[PDB]
Structure formats: C-alpha cells, structure tokens
Amino acid sequence: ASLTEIEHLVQSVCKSYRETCQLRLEDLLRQRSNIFSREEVTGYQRKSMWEMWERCAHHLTEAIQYVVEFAKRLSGFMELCQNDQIVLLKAGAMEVVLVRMCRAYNADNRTVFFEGKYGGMELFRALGCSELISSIFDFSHSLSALHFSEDEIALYTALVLINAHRPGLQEKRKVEQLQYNLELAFHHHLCKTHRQSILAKLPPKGKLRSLCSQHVERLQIFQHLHPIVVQAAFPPLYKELFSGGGEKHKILHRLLQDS
Ligand SMILES: O=C(Nc1ccc2c(c1)N(S(=O)(=O)c1cccc(C(F)(F)F)c1)CC2)c1c(F)cccc1Cl
DSSP: OOOOHHHHHHHHHHHHHHHOOOOHHHHHHGGOOOOHHHHHHHHHHSSSHHHHHHHHHHHHHHHHHHHHHHHHSTTTTTTTTTHHHHHHHHHHHHHHHHHHHHGGEETTTTTEEEETTEOOOOGGGGGGOHHHHHHHHHHHHHHHHTTTOOHHHHHHHHHHSSSSOOOOOOOOHHHHHHHHHHHHHHHHHHHTTTTTTHHHOOOOOOHHHHHHHHHHHHHHHHHHHHHHHHHHOOOOHHHHHGGGGSSOOHHHHTTTTTT
C-alpha cells in the first residue's frame, strides 16, 4: 500500500474510533472531581455477590457492544468471512474493552469511572474477585503512564482486535494482510507524531491475553456455583462470549448484519 493509502487508513481508523466511543474523553476528565462518598462505597460493598456480578456484567456487555460497532466500521473487517469475524470478536472484544478502560482510569488516585463517579478497587469488594480486580487496575495503571492520545488508542485497539494469531481463523492469510496494513499505519502515525518510543513501552501481547483468561476463568467459577442466576439475569451477549451453555442464543451474528 502506498504512503497516502497508509495515511488514509490512519484517518479512517481514527474516525471509526471517534464515532463508537462509549464515553467521551472530555466528560471523563471533568468527572475526576466527582468521587464516590465513603457511604456510597459502603453501599456497593454490602450488596450481594450475585447482584454485584450482574451489575458489572451488564456494564461490561454495554461496553463490548461499542467494540462490535468499532469492528463493524473497521476497514477490511466486514470484508472478512463471518466465522473469522466471530473468532476475532469472541477473543478480542474484552481485550479492546480492557484497553479502552484506561481512559476512564485516574492514575493520580488509582480510581476508575464507574456508574457516573470515580472509585478505587474497594468499590468492587462484593464481587469476591480481589486478584482479578487488582490485575485490571494495574493494567490500566500501566497504560495511563503512556499518556495515549485518542488517535493512538484508535490504532492500538484496532490491532488488538485484528490479530491473525487467533485460534480458529478460517482465512488466516487475509487477517495477516489486514494486520500488516494496520501496524504499518500505526507505525507511520507514531513516526509522524514523534511517539515511536511508545512501542518499546507497550505491554507484551501476552498480558492482554492473560488478563482475558483471568477474567473468563473466574466467570465460570461463578457460573458453576450460581448457574440459575446466570441464565436468568445475565445478559445474552455476555453468555455467548463467556459461558459454556450460552452459545445457543445467536447474538453476534445479528449485530454484524443490522448496519
Ligand atoms: O466488571 C467486570 N469487567 C468489566 C470490564 C470492563 C468494563 C466494565 C466491566 N464496565 S464497568 O462500568 O462495570 C467498570 C468500570 C471500571 C472498572 C471496572 C472493574 F473492572 F473494576 F470492575 C468495571 C465497563 C468497562 C467484571 C465482571 F463482569 C465479572 C467479574 C469481574 C469483573 Cl472485574
């Protein structure tokens, strides 16, 4: 691809990320002063474990839906075969959601934007997921040091999703060409912006994958112990991405058609 085609792809990715942002950046930076009271934190702490899980699962599902829209606008993604579109989203949607969260994370007090206000790790104590919640906060703490620009997050989360190493891809070769054109665009943008030192500081690819495994493997421990709660109160999209007996409901293969 030519240099201007590469510049074209940078702008098309950045505009695609602008249009499918769940939260606006200027709103997140003005809410940093809006912090949960200690009594509000205590409210979240005394809530029942299964109620706190459903609450967070729905908020996670809503964020993943904006990632599907992001994929749907990605250059080349909708040109892939559907089975590869599902494989890429089944694996990378939570990863994109975990990277996008670092915008809603305040490194200057180790708080995160949750339900309109910012709060620390102790907000989620009722989940009984101390280690998983810590890994998420530390992951966001690392990305916040990079001081990503919105354009840089656009190209980074694009590559997080368009990955040719994903198990199950039927047309692995076409995803390779997609991944190459995007990393060339990402690298070209970092070169024009004088932000190439970011690449050496980026987290190793495994930490994102290990975070997902940490996340998913913890869910079905909850789904095994509290199975009826998951089938009745957890949202469908969440069960298809993350549950064993939840792939019967077809949800992704309709978000990818209704355009
Ligand atoms: O909550 C979970 N994962 C998740 C991943 C990304 C996002 C959301 C949720 N939400 S959110 O507004 O609720 C929000 C906003 C800041 C921080 C957090 C938290 F990750 F600390 F919970 C959550 C949107 C972005 C979850 C779960 F469903 C089951 C077990 C353990 C966990 Cl962690």
